[PDB]
Design a protein around this motif. Structure first.
Motif, PDB file in Angstrom:
ATOM      1  N   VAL A   1      -9.428 -19.874   4.396  1.00  0.00           N
ATOM      2  CA  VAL A   1     -10.837 -20.015   4.070  1.00  0.00           C
ATOM      3  C   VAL A   1     -10.996 -20.137   2.553  1.00  0.00           C
ATOM      4  N   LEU A   2      -9.963 -19.702   1.845  1.00  0.00           N
ATOM      5  CA  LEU A   2      -9.976 -19.756   0.393  1.00  0.00           C
ATOM      6  C   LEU A   2      -9.141 -20.950  -0.075  1.00  0.00           C
ATOM      7  N   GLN A   3      -8.941 -21.887   0.840  1.00  0.00           N
ATOM      8  CA  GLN A   3      -8.167 -23.078   0.535  1.00  0.00           C
ATOM      9  C   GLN A   3      -8.929 -23.969  -0.449  1.00  0.00           C
ATOM     10  N   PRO A   4     -10.211 -24.251  -0.094  1.00  0.00           N
ATOM     11  CA  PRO A   4     -11.053 -25.086  -0.934  1.00  0.00           C
ATOM     12  C   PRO A   4     -11.528 -24.318  -2.169  1.00  0.00           C
ATOM     13  N   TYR A   5     -11.086 -23.073  -2.258  1.00  0.00           N
ATOM     14  CA  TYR A   5     -11.456 -22.225  -3.379  1.00  0.00           C
ATOM     15  C   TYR A   5     -10.215 -21.704  -4.106  1.00  0.00           C
ATOM     16  N   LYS A   6      -9.074 -22.271  -3.742  1.00  0.00           N
ATOM     17  CA  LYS A   6      -7.815 -21.874  -4.349  1.00  0.00           C
ATOM     18  C   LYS A   6      -7.849 -22.198  -5.844  1.00  0.00           C
ATOM     19  N   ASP A   7      -8.547 -23.277  -6.167  1.00  0.00           N
ATOM     20  CA  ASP A   7      -8.666 -23.705  -7.551  1.00  0.00           C
ATOM     21  C   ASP A   7      -9.987 -23.190  -8.127  1.00  0.00           C
ATOM     22  N   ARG A   8     -10.852 -22.743  -7.230  1.00  0.00           N
ATOM     23  CA  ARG A   8     -12.148 -22.223  -7.635  1.00  0.00           C
ATOM     24  C   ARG A   8     -11.979 -20.902  -8.386  1.00  0.00           C
ATOM     25  N   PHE A   9     -10.754 -20.396  -8.362  1.00  0.00           N
ATOM     26  CA  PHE A   9     -10.447 -19.145  -9.034  1.00  0.00           C
ATOM     27  C   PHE A   9      -8.980 -18.761  -8.834  1.00  0.00           C
ATOM     28  N   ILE A  10      -8.603 -17.651  -9.451  1.00  0.00           N
ATOM     29  CA  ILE A  10      -7.238 -17.164  -9.349  1.00  0.00           C
ATOM     30  C   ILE A  10      -7.138 -16.176  -8.184  1.00  0.00           C
ATOM     31  N   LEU A  11      -6.628 -16.675  -7.068  1.00  0.00           N
ATOM     32  CA  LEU A  11      -6.474 -15.851  -5.881  1.00  0.00           C
ATOM     33  C   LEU A  11      -5.306 -14.883  -6.085  1.00  0.00           C
ATOM     34  N   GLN A  12      -5.654 -13.626  -6.312  1.00  0.00           N
ATOM     35  CA  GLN A  12      -4.650 -12.597  -6.524  1.00  0.00           C
ATOM     36  C   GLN A  12      -4.322 -11.895  -5.204  1.00  0.00           C
ATOM     37  N   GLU A  13      -3.229 -12.330  -4.595  1.00  0.00           N
ATOM     38  CA  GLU A  13      -2.797 -11.754  -3.332  1.00  0.00           C
ATOM     39  C   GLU A  13      -2.075 -10.427  -3.574  1.00  0.00           C
ATOM     40  N   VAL A  14      -2.748  -9.348  -3.203  1.00  0.00           N
ATOM     41  CA  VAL A  14      -2.184  -8.019  -3.374  1.00  0.00           C
ATOM     42  C   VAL A  14      -1.628  -7.530  -2.035  1.00  0.00           C
ATOM     43  N   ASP A  15      -0.373  -7.109  -2.071  1.00  0.00           N
ATOM     44  CA  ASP A  15       0.286  -6.617  -0.872  1.00  0.00           C
ATOM     45  C   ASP A  15      -0.013  -5.125  -0.708  1.00  0.00           C
ATOM     46  N   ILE A  16      -0.923  -4.834   0.209  1.00  0.00           N
ATOM     47  CA  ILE A  16      -1.306  -3.457   0.473  1.00  0.00           C
ATOM     48  C   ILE A  16      -0.278  -2.816   1.406  1.00  0.00           C
ATOM     49  N   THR A  17       0.471  -3.671   2.087  1.00  0.00           N
ATOM     50  CA  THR A  17       1.489  -3.204   3.012  1.00  0.00           C
ATOM     51  C   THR A  17       2.616  -2.501   2.253  1.00  0.00           C
ATOM     52  N   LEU A  18       2.573  -2.635   0.936  1.00  0.00           N
ATOM     53  CA  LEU A  18       3.580  -2.020   0.087  1.00  0.00           C
ATOM     54  C   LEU A  18       3.239  -0.542  -0.112  1.00  0.00           C
ATOM     55  N   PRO A  19       4.279   0.238  -0.513  1.00  0.00           N
ATOM     56  CA  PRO A  19       4.102   1.662  -0.742  1.00  0.00           C
ATOM     57  C   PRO A  19       3.360   1.917  -2.055  1.00  0.00           C
ATOM     58  N   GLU A  20       3.787   1.208  -3.088  1.00  0.00           N
ATOM     59  CA  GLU A  20       3.175   1.348  -4.398  1.00  0.00           C
ATOM     60  C   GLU A  20       1.703   0.933  -4.343  1.00  0.00           C
ATOM     61  N   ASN A  21       1.382   0.146  -3.327  1.00  0.00           N
ATOM     62  CA  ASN A  21       0.019  -0.327  -3.149  1.00  0.00           C
ATOM     63  C   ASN A  21      -0.612   0.389  -1.954  1.00  0.00           C
ATOM     64  N   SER A  22       0.142   1.330  -1.403  1.00  0.00           N
ATOM     65  CA  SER A  22      -0.331   2.092  -0.259  1.00  0.00           C
ATOM     66  C   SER A  22      -1.776   2.538  -0.487  1.00  0.00           C
ATOM     67  N   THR A  23      -2.090   2.799  -1.747  1.00  0.00           N
ATOM     68  CA  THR A  23      -3.427   3.232  -2.112  1.00  0.00           C
ATOM     69  C   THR A  23      -4.461   2.186  -1.688  1.00  0.00           C
ATOM     70  N   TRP A  24      -4.237   0.961  -2.144  1.00  0.00           N
ATOM     71  CA  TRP A  24      -5.136  -0.133  -1.822  1.00  0.00           C
ATOM     72  C   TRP A  24      -5.362  -0.129  -0.308  1.00  0.00           C
ATOM     73  N   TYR A  25      -4.270   0.051   0.420  1.00  0.00           N
ATOM     74  CA  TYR A  25      -4.334   0.077   1.871  1.00  0.00           C
ATOM     75  C   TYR A  25      -5.090   1.313   2.364  1.00  0.00           C
ATOM     76  N   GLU A  26      -4.612   2.470   1.935  1.00  0.00           N
ATOM     77  CA  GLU A  26      -5.231   3.727   2.323  1.00  0.00           C
ATOM     78  C   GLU A  26      -6.751   3.635   2.180  1.00  0.00           C
ATOM     79  N   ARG A  27      -7.175   2.905   1.158  1.00  0.00           N
ATOM     80  CA  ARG A  27      -8.595   2.731   0.901  1.00  0.00           C
ATOM     81  C   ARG A  27      -9.130   1.523   1.672  1.00  0.00           C
ATOM     82  N   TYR A  28      -8.244   0.561   1.892  1.00  0.00           N
ATOM     83  CA  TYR A  28      -8.613  -0.645   2.612  1.00  0.00           C
ATOM     84  C   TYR A  28      -7.552  -1.009   3.652  1.00  0.00           C
TER      85      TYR A  28
END
Length: 100
Positions: free
Chosen positions: A36-63
């Protein structure tokens, strides 16, 4: 993929917003979302954050159930889907007149 094509008057500095995309798995949503962010891939910098990671567990825990999440300019733009309409809206006006 595609160099794309879309030129129009603007007269302004060059700098797109950073969209914090939080994907996970298994999740067929974060998958579509991106699409859905295909036509918006250039519309901005899509920062794909891996919440599945442990160091990012927080992002996940919250989301972990509020994904995929989307932060435009470091501000929850929308989550639980990709309401382009909403995105676009922000896109139009985000930074503003002289800011950052």
């Amino acid at each position: 993929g595609s160099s794309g094509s879309s030129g129009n008057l603007s007269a302004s500095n060059r700098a797109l917003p950073v969209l914090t995309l939080f994907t996970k798995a298994p999740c067929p949503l974060c998958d579509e979302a991106k699409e859905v962010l295909q036509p918006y891939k250039d519309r901005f910098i899509l920062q794909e954050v891996d919440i599945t990671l442990p160091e990012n567990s927080t992002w996940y825990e919250r989301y972990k159930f509020d994904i995929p999440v989307f932060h435009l300019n470091g501000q929850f733009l929308m989550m639980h889907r990709v309401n382009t309409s909403k995105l676009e809206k922000q896109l139009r006006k985000l930074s503003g007149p002289s800011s950052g």
